[PDB]
């Protein structure tokens, strides 16, 4: 019954064995993080929010009960379930509840709407949807277009749907007996991409437990730390970097908050004795100019400018840690004892000894040490393909199996910042068409959302009226489609006529560099 394996690109056997031999992959299921924590620190507080708090022993039972309830609706191991919940202790009840039923949760962010969730349901073959009332009209239009979503569970006023409280609490059961492959997907994360269809990222039990454990070790988390979840709990960053899960691997307390604004957050920190939190640079800067127990302030999600880094660890805490990471895998951290110049001018270095980074040029070659290039990555917790996204996989990965991040970075080869990364921007691909600076990359993403377009390349051709015209070189799926049809598709998606291709050219396949990126200079010297 599991197309779970159908959408999944596994880790190659030899790399998997290597990661097991090195102690990264420990053969235990994701939900065992709670189980083991519950056996070790039964009476330590596990999770806190405004109105509730649960010890590890109390949380362990709740997840068990939630799991029996979920299995009771007919949700079976491998089934994917869309999840969209606020920052509540209940988020933890749902995550491990779902995991213990053997379901594979899809971690949706609060800013996702019907278009996103609909596409997620389609990609994941989701059979259910968990939501909170602070969304019902959303669930209604979702099940209409995707009947396979047989269950809607609402934390709050359920209306016509199921009550999350009813189903998970006071619903007897035996707790289902499951046995997933730990090298198979435990959950699906959402990719913070472009426009663009968002993608789903499969994280295996093996690599996600490692991602949390290793991160919590690096951050030196102990049972005494109190981590504040200020970002949306379903995002990779506060979920496992080290986040709630990493916190749970050491028996630390996790505090959820709905309001990460300075006044409310400063209040929460003093009350619960918060020692750690993660923010984005905009929010870190806001807290700083709003101004102990805090000792670790992680900042990630976009580049912290060094003056703003300065502000942050002069006004908030010297215990700044820069984090450059992605839901797809690779995490770069500054280390806990690192010199101030490293905290303020770098975005860290890889989490794992066996994280492999390549910094390459536009041809696909390894750039000279210290030069800028595109970051490519492969390692013990980096995906080998997106879930159920064969066209995106051909496009997004190296032939060797390195993920192409689209990030422009340099690794300093000399000086006091040696060994560390700096993020300098995004790889760009601009076509100068008339008075418009058109992005080939986002034009290509738009064209790819057509069911007839398998692969696409927007290329610049010298033109006498426009300077450069836009040639869409396309690999079609079924029968080809005319430019006017593609133009109609682009307009419905909101692309103006000044960014639509002037010409359409079909090819049986697109040429690529030795890194898998479309070889556009080659496509030009044809056509």
Automatic annotation (TrEMBL):
Keywords: Ligase. It is an enzyme of class 6 (ligase). Belongs to the ATP-dependent AMP-binding enzyme family. Residues 35-387 form the AMP-dependent synthetase/ligase domain. This is 2,3-dihydroxybenzoate-AMP ligase. Its EC number is 6.3.2.-. The keyword Nucleus does not apply. Residues 443-517 form the AMP-binding enzyme C-terminal domain.
């Amino acid at each position: 019954q599991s197309s779970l394996l159908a959408g999944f690109t596994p880790f190659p056997a030899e790399r998997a064995q290597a990661y097991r031999a090195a102690g990264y992959w420990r053969d235990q299921l994701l939900d065992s993080v709670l189980r083991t924590a519950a056996r070790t620190w039964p009476d330590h507080i596990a999770v806190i929010d405004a109105d509730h708090r649960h010890t590890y022993a109390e949380l362990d039972r709740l997840a068990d009960r939630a799991a029996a309830g979920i299995a009771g609706l007919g949700i079976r191991p491998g089934d994917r379930v869309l999840v969209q919940l606020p920052n509540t202790a209940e988020f933890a009840v749902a995550l491990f509840g779902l995991l213990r039923a053997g379901a594979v949760p899809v971690m949706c962010l609060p800013g996702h709407r019907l278009a996103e969730l609909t596409h997620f349901a389609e990609v994941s073959s989701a059979v259910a949807l968990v939501v909170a009332d602070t969304h019902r009209d959303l669930a209604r239009e979702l099940v209409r277009s995707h009947p396979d979503v047989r269950h809607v569970l609402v934390d709050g006023d359920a209306a016509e749907f199921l009550s999350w409280a009813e189903v998970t609490r006071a619903a007897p059961g035996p707790v289902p007996e499951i046995a997933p492959d730990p090298a198979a997907p435990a959950l699906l994360l959402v990719s913070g991409g472009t426009t663009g269809a968002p993608k789903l990222i499969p994280r295996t039990h093996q690599d996600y437990v490692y991602n949390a454990t290793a991160s919590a070790e690096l951050c030196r988390l102990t049972a005494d730390d109190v981590y504040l979840v200020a970002l949306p709990a379903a995002h990779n960053f506060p979920l496992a970097c080290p986040g709630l899960l990493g916190a749970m691997t050491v028996g630390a307390t996790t505090v959820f908050t709905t309001d990460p604004s300075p006044e409310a957050a400063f209040a929460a920190i003093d009350e619960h004795g918060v020692t750690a939190t993660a923010l984005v640079p905009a929010l870190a800067k806001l807290w700083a100019q709003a101004c102990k127990t805090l000792r670790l302030l992680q900042v990630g999600g976009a580049k912290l400018a060094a003056p703003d880094a300065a502000l942050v660890r002069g006004a908030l805490t010297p215990g700044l840690q820069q984090v450059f990471g992605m839901a797809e895998g690779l995490l770069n951290y500054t280390r806990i004892g690192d010199p101030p110049e490293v905290l303020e001018n770098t975005q860290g270095r890889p989490l794992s000894p066996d994280d492999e980074i390549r910094i390459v040029d536009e041809v696909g070659n390894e750039v000279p040490p210290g030069a800028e290039g595109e970051l490519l990555v492969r390692g013990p917790y980096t995906l080998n393909g997106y879930f159920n996204a064969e066209a995106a996989n051909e496009r997004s990965f190296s032939p060797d199996g390195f993920y192409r991040s689209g990030d422009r970075v340099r690794r300093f080869a000399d000086g006091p910042l040696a060994g560390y990364l700096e993020v300098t921007g995004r790889i760009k691909d601009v076509i100068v068409r008339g008075g418009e600076n058109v992005s080939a990359l986002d034009l290509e993403e738009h064209l790819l959302t057509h069911p007839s377009v398998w692969a696409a390349a927007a290329v610049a051709l010298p033109d006498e009226f426009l300077g450069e015209k836009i040639c869409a070189v396309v690999v079609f799926n079924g029968p080809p489609v005319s430019l006017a049809e593609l133009h109609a598709h682009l307009e419905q998606r909101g692309v103006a006529a000044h960014s639509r291709p002037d010409a359409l050219v079909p090819m049986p396949s697109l040429p690529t560099t030795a890194v898998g990126k479309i070889d556009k200079k080659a496509i030009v010297r044809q056509l």
